[PDB]
Symmetry: D2
Subunit: 258 residues, 4 copies
């Protein structure tokens, strides 16, 4: 009825994803200190990998994205980035001399790249993304980030957290879901709000089970939250979401190896 | 049953959104049944087909000779699943009340909530029993001001107010879909704290959009036919996933509070 | 704090200020419901915690205001000599054996396990107000509650209800609402950047009032900051804003119970 | 038909005890039974006292160092030698009695300087990381990594609450957070009318009033008081125990090939 207002946030799921991936890319940029590289290899195209690889094009002569899933070539939006499936990278490493990266970035996280494969490189810089967020015994047990930091003259660990808030992982998707969930809880406590609905679904399923990157990108193109209320809440909805997005802090911690 | 790799498990809850909706609607229908104490009626009029109205009207067929659902939205006739229930849009009800003699209900149930039926329309009836659903959940100044439940309780020899809350939990309204959303949201919060869980996703969307803007009841019913929650974790969580959701569904308590009058 | 790198900030808002705001809202809700009517004799059951101020607020329009409490030591919580204090035993004996008790205004603030509908039924006042101890829905609490059974006399009847708008509270009790405001405020303050920890200055207040039977000590315990925060950056503004916003959410009103 | 008042059997001191014991066991596990001639622990409050006591078994001499002389009162074993910071610094410059093989820094934020730590050459150095979950302000003032500047074997003592948010690893903070989270859950139990934690600014008693005895008395109180219609004793203790069990303390070895 006209007694109740329906408000869809201006902030879309893709905007939250964008903000998180840009923070991760800037954390890497800052850590690299403008160094130029002949060949950068980034493992893991989903979800921040695509933009991170794009961000390296400026200072890297060649940027290669490596993924175990060949269909993830569809998540790359720049033809300047070379895509290689994991099997073709492993074959080229053994049979050729074209793979000799000076910059290696592992964004695979839990159950990802093996320290054995990383050990085959001798880069100037190695960055490994730490998938751990706040403390969880099970996640900490399966994590092997420290074992992956086994090569490179300069080593760094990319860490991403939500300041003053709890998140189980540093994964782009998890952080976006957590921002939306925390925002809903606070929005629901605003005076006059009847209900608050997050626009969420199992996005990872669209990418990895349905193998449909286009459909996944379409799914991100929608308001993060829908609110039903008696009073106007547009500024409040924006204040809460924006504050939760601003809490994301990404940085590369240098791992000293003398 | 896996995620990005085989090191992570993806678990979809066995409980679907429709199962939660069903549990809530059934509690509201049982609260009305209990209040009516088996009384038989010649003509029952239920205002508001979405969301619990459809099942509530169906539940009255046993003791009511004629059951009529009234809705301001004509397309909501599509949410009725029993041909025994008569549907009338609000305009047809108003005109037949003013110009005919076929509308004289002995049982009136108002489930419209906020911005719904007017006390003026309710005042045109002289039923044996009047039940008005209170849309208010936990206290909210804004919601309490627009609410006029007490003004709608203006006719009937026996009067009752249908109230629905989540025991020891916070909900802004008693609306079926608000309660379902809140059960899922609170369940996600708790599931996320289970050891080894990476993330928890509630399968939610603006369901009111499908029903009132797209005017698609079939699509809405299809949207309810899916897992309430999807969890990404390192260890098995199936047991906890169903237990947490079930515990939250069980907190729903619906009852008709009798409004004393002569 | 432990070093000069950490700041310790005590809220300017004291526990007593929160109590004051809540009791005043309950008294104003009753005032607006009474619509300026004058009474010869008002009887208020339950001195702790809002009862004392509510009885004081009735002095303007009531010739005689009597506070009745089952605990005789609660005469100490009254701050105005104009209010008559009567223990429950004397009231019950006076009702049965005398003619001095015939109130035109009766207010029951005892809540759960309080005054019986049988005692209320002995009065024939112009106005009866019963405080509803229920806050948000709880099956266990709704089962023991008998507010509706207590609203059995009076030409005009009302139920005093108190909630925190958009927040969760199990009861409408003054001290519980204060505790809940402080607890919710701590949770939000802890999430401010640079905060190390947030401590609510709370204790078992009823122990002082009802077990130690020391009203003065209890009043001293309320005379202290509601929250203490340890942080790296200044948080004074946010600390007061969060607490003030939570206090503002308290809403008290008397719902008239129609009886033609 | 009656309102019940229940005080938790678990006292604030029991929660403090459980946290300090986890920190001491994390250090024990990391030391792998190694024996030391002289251990120096910086920071007596709050876990320092018990940690120093726990080192007595494998260390010939255990010394607690604190910038506050009145903190000698928090030591419960006469076998631990107390030294104020000025007396340690004096003995380092003018004497030869201070040459620890085990150094443990538990001072946290605004504590011991890396310059003082650099004066030692121990077999093992352990620095407690005061950071809990991420906070920009706390991360900026923290200098734990700069303090890991000596020792053949280096470790960082980390303490968190599994699946729960805490701003620091400080014993006090963790106890407060366990009680606060427990109250929040207890309040949602059916029939509960109210839940009150017994909390106050304990640090003020120790550092401003300089009264360790009064502080210890303040910990000897039930953590929570609950008012309810139904019995909740079992659930009260279960929620508190489950929150205490979430505390996880461990020493993460800080690899340094040169040392
Ligand atoms: N061994 C391997 N080599 C290359 N890519 C891998 C891999 N194992 C997993 N991947 C890929 O790495 C990604 C894991 S998901 C990583 C999420 C990312 N850290 C973020 O925050 O957005 C997926 O694209 C997956 O297909
Ligand atoms: N004046 C009126 N007369 C009849 N139906 C109305 C109305 N105003 C609104 N409605 C209908 O009443 C419903 C309002 S939504 C009610 C939600 C319901 N109480 C529940 O808990 O599920 C919608 O079906 C709407 O179309
Ligand atoms: N039968 C009875 N008659 C009179 N006073 C009673 C009573 N039973 C309990 N009391 C008193 O009533 C108070 C109950 S506590 C009431 C709290 C109050 N509603 C508030 O919000 O502040 C106590 O003072 C208690 O001693
Ligand atoms: N430079 C210094 N040298 C020695 N002790 C210090 C110091 N600076 C602070 N301290 C002491 O170190 C302690 C800081 S509080 C440390 C809390 C502890 N990590 C816990 O979790 O319980 C206090 O006892 C303080 O007096
Ligand atoms: Na591990």
């Amino acid at each position: 009825t006209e007694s109740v207002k329906t408000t869809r946030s201006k902030i879309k799921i893709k905007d939250i994803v964008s903000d998180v991936v840009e923070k991760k890319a800037n954390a890497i940029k800052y850590f690299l200190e403008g160094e130029e590289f002949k060949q950068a290899i980034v493992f893991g195209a989903y979800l921040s990998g695509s933009y991170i690889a794009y961000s390296l094009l400026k200072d890297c002569e060649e940027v290669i994205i490596v993924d175990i899933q060949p269909h993830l070539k569809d998540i790359l939006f720049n033809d300047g980035i070379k895509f290689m499936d994991l099997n073709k990278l492993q074959l080229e490493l053994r049979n050729g001399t074209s793979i000799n990266p000076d910059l290696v970035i592992d964004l695979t996280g839990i159950g990802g790249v093996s320290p054995d494969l990383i050990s085959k490189f001798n880069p100037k810089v190695l960055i490994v993304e730490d998938p751990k967020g706040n403390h969880d015994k099970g996640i900490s047990k399966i994590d092997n980030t420290d074992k992956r930091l086994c090569v490179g003259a300069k080593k760094g660990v990319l860490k991403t957290y939500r300041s003053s808030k709890f998140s189980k992982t540093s994964g782009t998707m998890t952080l976006v879901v957590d921002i939306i969930m925390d925002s809903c809880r606070e929005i629901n406590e605003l005076d006059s709000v009847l209900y608050t609905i997050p626009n969420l679904k199992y996005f990872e399923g669209t990418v990895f089970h349905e193998k449909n990157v286009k459909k996944f990108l379409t799914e991100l193109n929608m308001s993060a939250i829908t609110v039903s209320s008696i009073d106007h809440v547009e500024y409040e909805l924006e204040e809460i979401l924006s504050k939760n997005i601003s809490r994301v802090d990404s940085f590369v911690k240098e791992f000293d190896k003398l």
